[PDB]
Amino acid sequence: GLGPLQIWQTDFTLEPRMAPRSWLAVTVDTASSAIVVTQHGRVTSVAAQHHWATAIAVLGRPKAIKTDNGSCFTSKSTREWLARWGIAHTTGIPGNSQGQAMVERANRLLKDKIRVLAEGDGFMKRIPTSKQGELLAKAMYALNHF
Amino acid sequence: GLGPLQIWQTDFTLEPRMAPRSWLAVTVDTASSAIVVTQHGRVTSVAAQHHWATAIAVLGRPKAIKTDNGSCFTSKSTREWLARWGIAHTTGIPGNSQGQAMVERANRLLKDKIRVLAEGDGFMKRIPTSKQGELLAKAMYALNHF
Numbered sequence: 001g002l003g004p005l006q007i008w009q010t011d012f013t014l015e016p017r018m019a020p021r022s023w024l025a026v027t028v029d030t031a032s033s034a035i036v037v038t039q040h041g042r043v044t045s046v047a048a049q050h051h052w053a054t055a056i057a058v059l060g061r062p063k064a065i066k067t068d069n070g071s072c073f074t075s076k077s078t079r080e081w082l083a084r085w086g087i088a089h090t091t092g093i094p095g096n097s098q099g100q101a102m103v104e105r106a107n108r109l110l111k112d113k114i115r116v117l118a119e120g121d122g123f124m125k126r127i128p129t130s131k132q133g134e135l136l137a138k139a140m141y142a143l144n145h146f
Numbered sequence: 147g148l149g150p151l152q153i154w155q156t157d158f159t160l161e162p163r164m165a166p167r168s169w170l171a172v173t174v175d176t177a178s179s180a181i182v183v184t185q186h187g188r189v190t191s192v193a194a195q196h197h198w199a200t201a202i203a204v205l206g207r208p209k210a211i212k213t214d215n216g217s218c219f220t221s222k223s224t225r226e227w228l229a230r231w232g233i234a235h236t237t238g239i240p241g242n243s244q245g246q247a248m249v250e251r252a253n254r255l256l257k258d259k260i261r262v263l264a265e266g267d268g269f270m271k272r273i274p275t276s277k278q279g280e281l282l283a284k285a286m287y288a289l290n291h292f
Contacts, residue, residue, distance in 0.1 A: 049280070050279055050280060053279065053280040053283040053284065054279075054283050056283065056284075056287050057283040057284070057286040057287040057290070058204050060287070060290075060291045061287070061291070133196055133199065133200075134195070134196060134199040137199040137200050137202065137203040138199065138202075138203070140203040141202050141203040141206070141207070144203070144206075145206045145207070
């Protein structure tokens with residue numbers, strides 16, 4: 001069973017077309033390149049935990065999650081949340097440089113699919129709050145399934 | 147490629163522990179037995195479409211979806227939503243009898259995992275609104291992943 005390790009890269013990226021819940025939490029399973037995305041009104045430790053609870057239910061529990069040093073990922077609260085689940089976590093190497101690259105690339109693809117799909121429906125600025133959920137779901141389906 | 151057909155069974159089931167958003171929309175992919183669950187305040191055609199947009203993003207697009215004749219699945223609105231996506235749909239045979247059985251079984255397992263997990267955390271009645279999301283996510287992770 002010499003298959004890829006069950007390792008995720010998670011990050012937040014802001015997206016004004018999804019306001020008021022413009023902070024998008026994106027997780028890339030580096031074993032499969034699957035992407036999981038959720039929306040949030042504020043970047044807090046808890047928004048990070050809610051994001052991962054959903055990712056877990058969708059991709060299964062990982063062995064480890066790799067994030068940057070944003071404070072929502074390094075607070076005591078998230079440390080304990082992750083210890084509870086049995087998930088290892090690392091912020092990488094001080095002044096990483098690279099190694100968060102799949103997630104940084106995923107954030108950019110994700111934001112361009114949102115924009116091309118939004119504009120396809122006639123929304124050139126903020127998308128109406130009522131259309132957001134389905135539109136986010138649609139972008140995620142597009143980036144995972146072929 | 148003589149593998150199972152990409153067919154889903156979807157239904158709604160009420161769950162007072164998740165109030166106010168007590169209507170749980172459950173979809174079983176009959177090819178893999180994967181389950182996808184979302185919560186809603188009201189059973190409407192739209193809640194059905196939002197449920198499926200999420201299922202799609204998680205399990206990919208199915209060839210066909212099998213439901214009962216609840217009105218939220220047979221309104222013009224859902225018909226058009228499904229035509230838009232290219233998804234076939236059937237309410238089965240008049241007075242079906244059986245054939246919605248995986249989804250009926252999934253609804254019952256799902257409701258017992260919610261109850262045993264809720265009670266594990268000390269909530270013997272309604273679960274606090276703030277804990278629901280993670281608790282639903284947790285039940286879904288438990289029923290899909292082993």
